[PDB]
Structures are given as C-alpha cells and as structure tokens.
Amino acid sequence: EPAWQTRDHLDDPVIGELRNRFGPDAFTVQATRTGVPVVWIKREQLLEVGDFLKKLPKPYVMLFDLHGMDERLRTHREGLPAADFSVFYHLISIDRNRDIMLKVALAENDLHVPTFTKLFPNANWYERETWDLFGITFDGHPNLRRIMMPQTWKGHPLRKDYPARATEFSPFELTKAKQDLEMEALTFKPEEWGMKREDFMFLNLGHGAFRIVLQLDGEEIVDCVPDIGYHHRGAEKMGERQSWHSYIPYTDRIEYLGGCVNEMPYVLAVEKLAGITVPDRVNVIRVMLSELFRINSHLLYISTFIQDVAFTDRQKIYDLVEAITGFRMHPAWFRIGGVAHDLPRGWDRLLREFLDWMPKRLASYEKAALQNTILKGRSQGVAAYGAKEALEWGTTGAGLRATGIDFDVRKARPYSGYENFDFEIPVGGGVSDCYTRVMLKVEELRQSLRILEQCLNNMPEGPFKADHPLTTPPPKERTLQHIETLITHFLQVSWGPVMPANESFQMIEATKGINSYYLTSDGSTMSYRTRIRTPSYAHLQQIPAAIRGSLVSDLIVYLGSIDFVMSDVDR
C-alpha cells in the first residue's frame, strides 16, 4: 500500500477508545491523506474529549496545532458535517508516536468555541490567531484580541470573502498610526494586553525585530506579552491565491535561513495530494540540500550566540547552493516532480571540498565552546524547564530533545528516504538549558555533516523527476521535443496542476524545530486551505512561562538562545 493512500484510520486504537468512551456516534471519522486519524467532534463534547485524550495511559500531551478554516466555499464535502467554518486541533502523542486531529464544525450565526487554554496553555496564541484571521470567537479566553493585525483592523483576513489584495495606500491612515505610536506610552492601558495593574513600570522593548512589552519590579521582570505580527506577510492567504506550483517561493520565504528545508514540506504534501512517489535520487538530493541549509542555519545560530559573549563557512555553503540551484538564499528549486534541474557536472568536487575542511572547523568550534567559562557561566541555569513547560508550550526544537524527550521527525516519522541514512540524533539530559541547546545543535551539525558525507558516497543515478503525469513541471527536454509533455507543461504552467479534492499533511524536522504543512484541496488548481505550523510561534509563546522571575539581560540572553525568526513566527 502506498503511503499517500486515502486512509480512514479506524484501526487506530485511539478511535476505539473514543468509541468506548463517547459511544459509536457523536463523532465522525474522516478519511484523508493526512496520515493521521481525523475525527469531527461536536462543540459541546470538545472539552471532555480533550480531557479524555489528556488522561490516556499514553496521553496526547502536546497541542501541535490549532487553527480555523472557512468551509463556506468548499464544494467537495462528502462524509463531513454541515459546517460554515471549522476549527481543527492537531494533537501529538510521543509515547504512542502518533497524532490525531479534532475538527469542530461551526455555523455563521454562532462562531463560538469553548477555549482550550485550560487544557493546553499554548492554545492562547493559536486562539488569538484564529480570532484575528477568522471570525471565530473563543469563550472564556483572557485578552482575546488580534495578534497578527493591529487592533484597528475591520475585517478578518483568512475569511474567503476578504480580498487578498493590497488596497490603496492612504497617508491619512499612516498618520493616524504614527500619532498612535507617538502616544502609545502615554495612553497605555494595561488591561487590553492582559496585565496586572508602585514598582511596576510598563515599557515597550523594541532574528527579526519585534516589540515585547515588559512589566518591571525595578529591574526584575514580572510580566511580558511579546507583541508579534510585525512581520506578517500573509503566506496562507496567498496560498489560497497562488497555484500549487507558484507557491514554492512563498514557502521559501517564510523561514529564510531554512529555505529549501521550508519548501520541503509543501512539496511533500503536494505529492501526497497528487499521489506521487518520487524516486530515490530525488530523495537523496532533498536530504542533501535540507542538511546543507540546516548546517547554514545552525552555523549562523552558533555564531550569533557566541558573538556577543563564521563568514567563510556560510559563503562556501552558499557557493555550493548557487552551483546546485539558482541564487544562494531562496533556491525555489524543489518542484512537484521533485527538483527543477538535475545536479551539475561538478557537485562531487564542491561537496568533497566542503566535507574535507569542515571537521577541523567543528573541532575549533567545540574547543571554543568548551573553554569559554564566561559564556558557560552566563548560559548555565537560565530559563530552566524540564519536559513539562516544553511538553505543553509546543517547543519542538532543540529544547524538546534537551529535556530528554526522544522525538525527532526524521526518526519517528521518516520522510524522503531518511531511513536509508545512518545518523544518531542527540538528546539532552533533564534541564533544557541554553548551553545544552547550543551543544545539541552542535551535535546536530556534526550529524548533518555525517548525513552529507553519506549523500556524497552513495548517490543513485536515476531520474530527477517522477514518471507521474502530475509532476509540475514535466522534464524540459521532453517538453521541447514531445507534444504530450508540451500539453502537460502548458496546462501545469498556465492554469496549474489539477489535483483531486483531498486533505494532506506533512510534518518535517526543520532547521529550528518541527515545521508542518496542512493542505486542503477543493479539486481546483489553487489551494483551498494552506496551514503552516511553525516552531518559532510556540517558541515565542513560552517566554512568559520561563522568564517570570528573571532580569532583562537574562530575557535577551534567552531570546538569543532561542533560534526563532520573526518572519517564521508571523508567516
């Protein structure tokens, strides 16, 4: 059986547990291509269903995702409840090494959902994002406001009736916002931000750039709401606009340091929708480029964390990326067939030159990072949390394995032929300290070098594009001298590849955590729904849960130790 087959997952024992608990009725199992069991739960049963899932013998401990969807324009809805809107909760159980999806249907007149922050505290920002982008209100939610758009925003962006175009730029509105920014500290009301109202001083503290409001007891900091949404590009709303093929640069531009790693999950989910099984050479090329960009991101993170208390490495990786792909930063090279072009006739020499010179650089990096007693003393014991503040606040990056939780996507749910590459993932012990996170990323960088060495050793010489008719684009030479290939190239470039109406989901170990794409297709050439779950969103949500009882310097050292990206957070 192919891995892209539309499965119903009634053989999952969690479905049997739900049938034993809440009866065979009262929930509807949906057969999707997401690879996870999807159950439609009624609205009033949602809290007790989540409570039952939290009290299993191997419970579903992490809320992976929580977001809405506009079902008003969805034509192909067979086996689904009558829904104007829907809210889906993606939950992960690591002990079971499984995951479930919980969809709640909503009508136009009553867009009210019971809150989920009393069960999973990372649901706060997800429910705020659902209230911002959709019109869905959550009952019993503190400081429920817009998180991606400013509070002076009328419509809801991710709704289907909202136009996804830039309107005329009036300077009068920009002058209102400039005057508001001038009096932001003067007319500051700490009740809209969800704050406690003589020591307490409120200030806006201006990788990316973002404001974080701070409540001061002298220098020691008691409350903080990091103001995000300043880097909101509307990647999902443009996903409803672009076709399956034109959205690849937008998947590059959500996380610029990752790039090709970030166009991996969209491509894999699109291939799941199209039913494409790519050959092994495509898988090896994907693995090599993903680990190359992972090495780039890890080297930049280590260099940034070590600078405050690198050029030639990133330039050589960028030269190799420029040789393989187009320009260095945003490759836009992963296609639905799998790659845009074949590898050139000199990549062996460049990859071997890169791999025969980096181990001594790793030795120098480890000698530096093991001997800086000032950096070790500054980075020890700061923002300490073991497995509990990391199992409930998302935190799927190097911190999750720094807690000791053995959960890597490349091993738990292998993709793109990562089972064929031998690499031992690193895991921390106990406390997820900042220094332990940096050492974990150093060991991950060493493992990525090992994976690249394995890719250089055994590269298959098969095709670089699959034989499926939905590979967009088709191979170029056959397009240029055969007419059927010209037909497929024409209709997959002009209108877009017509993909059947299914639901797909790809979960990927990114350069900074777990990035996932969730694509709902309505049978058209566009995407009816594109959902991008990002690690840095949940990594930024956990600063209030960790830096309550620390200083500003400790806060910004923790902020530097987090590998977050603001454009990655705000999509």
Binding site: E219, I374, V552
Partner: protein, 162 residues
C-alpha cells in the same frame, strides 16, 4: 603619577625631564607605568573601557542623541585626550625629548607615535572585559599596588639619600 613626582621631587615637567637625564623612569617604576597607562586609557574612555552599557539593556551610550559637530567634537576630544596621555606617558616615564643623534622634537614625536601604535596594538589584542572585573581590578588590584609602589619608591629614594 606621584610615583614619578616622588622620584623626581617636583611637579614641573622640565624637572621631570632633567631628573630623567641618566635613567628613564619606566625601568624603576614599571608598576607606576602600567597603572598610569590603564588609568589614562580608562579616563579617555578608550576601547577596553568603552560602552559600559553593553552589559545591560536598560542603559544606552551617552554618545547618542548627539548629531553632527557635537558628536564629532566628542570623537576628536577623545583622540586629543589619548594623544596627550601618550605625550604625558613618554615625558613622565620615557626620556622627554632625550636622544643620541636625532633632534629632541623629532625624538619626542617618534616616541609619541610609538605609544600611539602601541595603543593601536593593545586595542587590536585585548578583548573587552565586562563591568564587574573592571571595577574589581580598578579598585582592588590598582589602588593598593600604586600605594605600595609609592611606599617602595619612598624607601629606595630615602635609602640612597646623600
């Protein structure tokens, strides 16, 4: 500086450069030399004792909110301070305008520029310490050492009193 004044006996600079007629003051008082160099660097707000707001984020530099000729005046004032500290250091520890063959002003300019290149070198070599060892050093290691230097130079100039 009282180390050199106690070795010479007067405040006047001509008396210093005439009391350095046989031996230069750098070799009997090397502790005074290094303490005066460190103090001259720190008073002038040069590179190791620069941006003390770097260890905090509720503090920014005082150089900000100036623009144009005021910030330029701050910059050139720091540099005339470091070159006059170089001139004071050579005329108080090395030989003030003293040399075998070259003219005295040429010798003074050469030794001053020699101190300037030494300042460039110690800028290029030593990394920035943080604030706590800066205070701890500048009190605990700096002030008892110069007091002991004054006591020892008093003892040796009173021992050979003829």
């Amino acid at each position: 500086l009282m180390g050199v004044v106690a070795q010479a006996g007067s405040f006047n600079m001509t008396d210093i450069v005439n009391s350095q007629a046989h031996v230069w003051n750098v070799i009997p008082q090397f502790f005074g030399f290094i303490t005066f160099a460190i103090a001259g660097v720190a008073v002038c707000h040069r590179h190791p004792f620069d941006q003390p707001e770097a260890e905090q984020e509720l503090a920014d530099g005082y150089h900000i909110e100036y623009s144009g000729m005021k910030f330029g005046l701050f910059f050139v004032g720091e540099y005339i301070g470091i070159v006059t500290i170089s001139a004071l250091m050579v005329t108080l520890f090395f030989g003030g305008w003293q040399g075998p063959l070259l003219p005295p002003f040429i010798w003074f300019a050469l030794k001053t520029a020699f101190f300037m290149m030494m300042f460039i070198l110690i800028r290029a070599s030593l990394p920035r310490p943080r604030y706590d060892q800066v205070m701890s050093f500048g009190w605990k290691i700096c002030l008892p050492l110069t007091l002991i230097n004054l006591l020892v130079t008093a003892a040796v100039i009173l021992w050979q009193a003829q």
